[PDB]
Design a protein around this nucleic acid. Sequence first.
RNA 1: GGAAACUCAAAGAGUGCUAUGGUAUGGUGACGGAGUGCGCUGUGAACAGAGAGCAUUUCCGGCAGCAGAGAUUUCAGCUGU
Lengths: 138, 461, 409, 38, 374, 166, 90
Amino acid sequence: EHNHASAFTRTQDVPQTELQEKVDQVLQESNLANPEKDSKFEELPEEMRKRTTEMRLMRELMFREERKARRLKKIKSKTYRKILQNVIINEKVNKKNLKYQSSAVPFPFENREQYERSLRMPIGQEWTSRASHQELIK
Amino acid sequence: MKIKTIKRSADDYVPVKSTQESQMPRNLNPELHPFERAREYTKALNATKLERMFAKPFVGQLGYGHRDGVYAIAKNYGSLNKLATGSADGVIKYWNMSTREEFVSFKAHYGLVTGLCVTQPRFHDKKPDLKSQNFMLSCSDDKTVKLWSINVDDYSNKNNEEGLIRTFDGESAFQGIDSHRENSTFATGGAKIHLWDVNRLKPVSDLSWGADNITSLKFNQNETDILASTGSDNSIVLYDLRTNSPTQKIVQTMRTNAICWNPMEAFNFVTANEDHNAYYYDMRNLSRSLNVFKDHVSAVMDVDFSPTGDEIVTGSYDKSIRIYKTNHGHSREIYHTKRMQHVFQVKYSMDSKYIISGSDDGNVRLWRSKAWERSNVKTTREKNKLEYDEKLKERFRHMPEIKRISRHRHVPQVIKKAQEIKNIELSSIKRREANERRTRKDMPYISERKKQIVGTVHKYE
Amino acid sequence: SSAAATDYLLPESNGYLEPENELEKTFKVQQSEIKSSVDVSTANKALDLSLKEFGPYHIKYAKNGTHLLITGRKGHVASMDWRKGQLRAELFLNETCHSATYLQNEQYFAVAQKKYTFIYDHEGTELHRLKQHIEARHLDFLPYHYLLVTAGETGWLKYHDVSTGQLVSELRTKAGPTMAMAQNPWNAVMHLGHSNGTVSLWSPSMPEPLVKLLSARGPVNSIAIDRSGYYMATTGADRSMKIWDIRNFKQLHSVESLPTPGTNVSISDTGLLALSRGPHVTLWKDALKLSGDSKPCFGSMGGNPHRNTPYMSHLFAGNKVENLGFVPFEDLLGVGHQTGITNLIVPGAGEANYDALELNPFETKKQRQEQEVRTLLNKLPADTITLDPNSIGSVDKRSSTIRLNAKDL
Amino acid sequence: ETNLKKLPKLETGFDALANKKKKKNVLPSNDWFTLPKP
Amino acid sequence: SKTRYYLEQCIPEMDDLVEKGLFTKNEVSLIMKKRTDFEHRLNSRGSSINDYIKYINYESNVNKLRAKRCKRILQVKKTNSLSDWSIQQRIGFIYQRGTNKFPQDLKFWAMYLNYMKARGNQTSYKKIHNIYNQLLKLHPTNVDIWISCAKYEYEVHANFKSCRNIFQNGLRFNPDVPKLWYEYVKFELNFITKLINRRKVMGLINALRGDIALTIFDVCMKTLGKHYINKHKGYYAISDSKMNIELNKETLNYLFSESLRYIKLFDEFLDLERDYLINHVLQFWKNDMYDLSLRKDLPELYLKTVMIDITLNIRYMPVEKLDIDQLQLSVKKYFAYISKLDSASVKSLKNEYRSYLQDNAEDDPRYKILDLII
Amino acid sequence: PIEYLLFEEPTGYAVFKVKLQQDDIGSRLKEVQEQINDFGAFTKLIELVSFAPFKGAAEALENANDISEGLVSESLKAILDLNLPKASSKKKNITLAISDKNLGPSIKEEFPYVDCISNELAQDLIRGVRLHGEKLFKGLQSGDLERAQLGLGHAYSRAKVKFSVQ
Amino acid sequence: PPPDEEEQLLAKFVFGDTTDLQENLAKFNADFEAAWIDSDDEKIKVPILVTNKTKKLRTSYNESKINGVHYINRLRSQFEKIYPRPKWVD
RNA sequence: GGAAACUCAAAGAGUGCUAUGGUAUGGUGACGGAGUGCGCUGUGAACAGAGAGCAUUUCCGGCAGCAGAGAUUUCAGCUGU
């Protein structure tokens, strides 16, 4: 999988419009990779209680990776701080529907209990839910 | 007294606006749905009958065939629809199987082109242009291996000197060829098996066990440095290309016509030999086959694996081809035609859905691997119906009434009569060996999977 | 588990009526009081046709409750959409008709006439005169098998395939005329009641009855089977209702000495038991259960809670009812009697949640067409009718239960 | 900080378009080639 | 059917929601029959985005009732079981289905984005990125989506690199509406203002200029002029030189009115070098525009830019110390204008007098100013 | 693999994403040849991911001439750079299905990571989306496509012949 | 577990409750002692369970004999439910 | 034979409608989000990234006090339980 064609970045990494090459030659006259703007905001009890205005100022001021590093620094600092009979059935053989039942037990099973435990549940739409039907027929 | 009846209300069951479908309330009570075994038995029976009427497997022959019967075929393992075929009169052809028409033909040699395969030739001075040129090389009995390039219209990136970029040369004839799947290498069997690369005009190494010739060759597809070959002393030899040497051989009863390696299991291969069956062998233990695929009635000429590794196709000297599930050992399907004679080459296309057979009247024919299966794209209702019917035929597979229908084919008269006299012969020898076993003392029970190996170098402990 | 979790998705709830007092008995609740207490749609479903001049009307509903088929004893057969006002066949066949049934639809119905059974299309043109089925008195259609089953004054039971057109089976009952007849909806075997007091369970494969039960003394006036295929209520002419287990063939209940012989029984989809003894119709709730506290009584001697008094009763004071039939997915009991038809609002008496792809009460013309072709395509063969339905995937009860590995051969 | 609070922000109409509502009413409800039949 | 699949996907959350003893079976059957109605209306024929919207509103209402009933019954605010995220996940999937079916109503797309943003910590910003990516793919020409995408990723996340990439890609797609140009110069001025204010703040606790905004200003003028001369006179150039010069004049009027709006909403960025950043637009407008804005017609525009260049230091309050410093500059401006102009001389004199009188003891220094500008 | 599809049309450019490949070997068969006529199965193959409409009839005529003589215009560059993923140029390029074998070279001249296919599979995918048209686009264009076709055909013809109204 | 008014409002929305709808349809309404006592019935005492018609005007299953004024009121309510009370009298 | 129709049925043909699950939502606290590490894309390096993968105890989905945010509900961080 290649990196997706996003609308948050440049899909060629060389300036593709006149605007882009103008902005990049100005920005390489004065670069803005923001290592300076990382080291500028990577600096900033009574620091907790009294500094309730410069804290909000630095919160508004800091950039994306600066705020990520500030969250990581606060997380690491707090984690370092804390830790006669009535029924007569006939038993004749049903010679017309002994063709609807198999002759012996088929190969992968060892007995008809196993084999009929395979056959015991219908996979139909009418007898399972839709999700179970799909799991049974894929 | 409190009282409540059924209030059906007609807003939930027949819709207000006419453009939309009606509600289908369900209720999964088995009281509501009574005949749950009989109903899906009849659906499985109607699925087997629908398969037996939808089985129309012949797609079409491609082109006009050759002039003198197709004895070599090679697919290329990276493009879906391209196919190289060579005949007895030395002509080779490259095929677009979409339009069923040749990109190019080539009077390649003078004798039989006895082998051909395809390459991505790793030259270290030039760069291979594989988006507009395809490469096939081919060996014949006039002591030549020739490498050809083909102009291919598959990408439209560019806009050119097509044929015969080089000519390797041996002192004796060649009989088989297969290309390594990397590193510019191929191997040719013949009077002796040589290894070659596409830069040097001479063999890098001769890797022959003894002074007995080699009839066929296949490289492995994964673990690509393991070769296998069939020699006319009924021998199957494995070679390794790390050690640059043969590895182990076995001698069988009759002669192995072909090998194909399993593309999904990397140590299993299938041999196709002259007693009329195929043998599924493990490379790590050649003392026993791990399957025998038995249903042919004359000498099996060629075998191939599905790219899913789950089934094999197997064309034989009785003028018919047969498709086998890999775990069973009998034929799942037989394809025949009154026009098809003596199928000498079979490949299984990289789609795993079509089967290419080269016969010896000249023609190369496409078939469906699943005959009842059509190749359109399917809406979810028909796709769900088709896989529901497959699962239902699967779980009712052994009922006698649907087994006698799914088992049924029309086989030619010659194959049917050979089949029934083969049956009465095998039943007679089982009767006589049962009598002989009743009398005599120590008759060992030899397995069917061992009944066809006369011996093995590098014995197993 | 996932199939049983659908009871959340079930849309409707079953009906009931509950006493909420100890002075308020449930069998003394009047039909006009029900029609006042329930909604206008159900009150309009409780129809009443007064058809005086032709005979007592055998009633029949389609398997979804959309169509009604009445037959006068004299000649008057009318197939109609009882819930709209649409009749689609009114034919006066001036010989004494006995019974009728729909086949797979409102589109075809079979009537049992003076002797021969006839088959009519949707608008009433005669399609078939069956030269077999010599004297039918009882017709019933088997919808999953497409079989019209026929019994009557001859001692013969005939299964006729409606789709192909072919008489599947002729079976000698060998017990004289067939006094009653019902179909097990579970496994499609036919319970016929004879003049011996004997019910016999039949299949179109075996030329002998699958089972013979000794239900009553005298003859057997009526048989009804639950739709779960578990219980069977038989009324004899010896003033005896008897509830039977079908699967294990035990006799669950024996209500002897009814005041007059029960001429009909019916069992709803929710297991009510509607017995009819001439002018009277009497319904019991939870009577088809194993315990002796579910034996249907007629009064509770001193207020015993362990006595199954009637769930509701009605008196057709003028006449004697001909037959009973519950309307399939609604809370009604259609009783056909000497002066026509009457539906009764019975609140506990119907499956509130049908399945709409088995059989749909709101189905359209295109849905009827495609469902007809699809059920015709998956018609079950008549040989698959066994006493249990789950015995056509198995192995033989011969052919040893361990599979054999040829060493032991 | 108040100047950063009062700097002109980027304006859209997209989430207002999500929270938009309407004031709409409802208004009420030969061939070229055929020769003339004489 | 697929309504059956979705409806029985809804069952484990109400398994859990009956086990946690807040709902009962008879009321959860009622919410299932309402949800059955909605799922059938969704995936049947003749479907509507109002069916989708009413389903989302119903699911949000049963979510709010579930939260209320949880707080009243269990006296916790979440049961940390399945039944507190499944219903918001359902709403998100109804939104995804609706935007896959009818990807044409930006009201529904923006309701999706609003609910997905307001879901809070539980959502993922890459999940918002995915629906921004596919929405910008389907509607590249609609420009408020580009503004909203970049506004979400600067005014919430402060991601300057990705915000610059969004604005450059949008200006690649439709370099014709001036609104995207103005929001890009607005973003660049906001970014450089935050840069110099964090510099000022790090100074007060403890090179890279508006020339970006000037360069995008320059390409804004060039490409907006190109696209107006290509938009009007549309098919061909079948027009004689009278109509060609009429067109070129009108594009100069169009472009210069947009730069007038640019300076009008450019003045309020007064934390950077606002004098330099307005004077560079002044010097970029002062040059020739190939059809004699000064030496011919648009002389009213030349007088407007001359008045702007005069008052460009006099953009001040009634405390007129800058006027007392450099009103001689305005006098020399009026003299240099009236040395050439004929009626624009009297117009510029009366206009500068009226402007200074309207904008400017305190009336006695203003009496000195009135005697000066009299 | 035919991963993306580029359909040019008078209202703008459309990039579709190929969901399911059609058959290569069975591409001449009856069911494969009429699945592109059935719409219920063609929507299993093709999904619309992007549609950049034109700025008017002027840019429509410019892009009609550029598409006619086989050049990548600036709106093409914009929509392809938005939609196609940054694949490699030496190993597994992203595959775009076009209908013009001499527009392909202009696409690889601008995006070297894109190999372009216009053979019979891409041709019948393209004529499937031509056969269905307004149904694939889900309602997202202004202007009826045949009305824009009439305008663009008349404009293209008068440009090509230099029709003067003087 | 008390009730709540906001909870019952949006519960009436979610469960689809037309109870207030039927209440409003029933509510809206389109808005825009005796001259003799005989002193014999009080000391009479009737049986109840001797005939089937009077067998229905018991309030228990243990009542067998009731007082006369009670019995008169029972069959007055029974007369009122045979012939319902019209509006012209009251 | 004929006439009528907001009449009742039985069927045939064509056309219309995103008619779209190639194996169905981002998540049964079994979970999600944040961050890190591995992996991936355009032999080592820095750079540019993708959302398309995999861990595990790094934190959060606990409570207040307090200021901040948007239209009385939700949203955003410091000091301890």
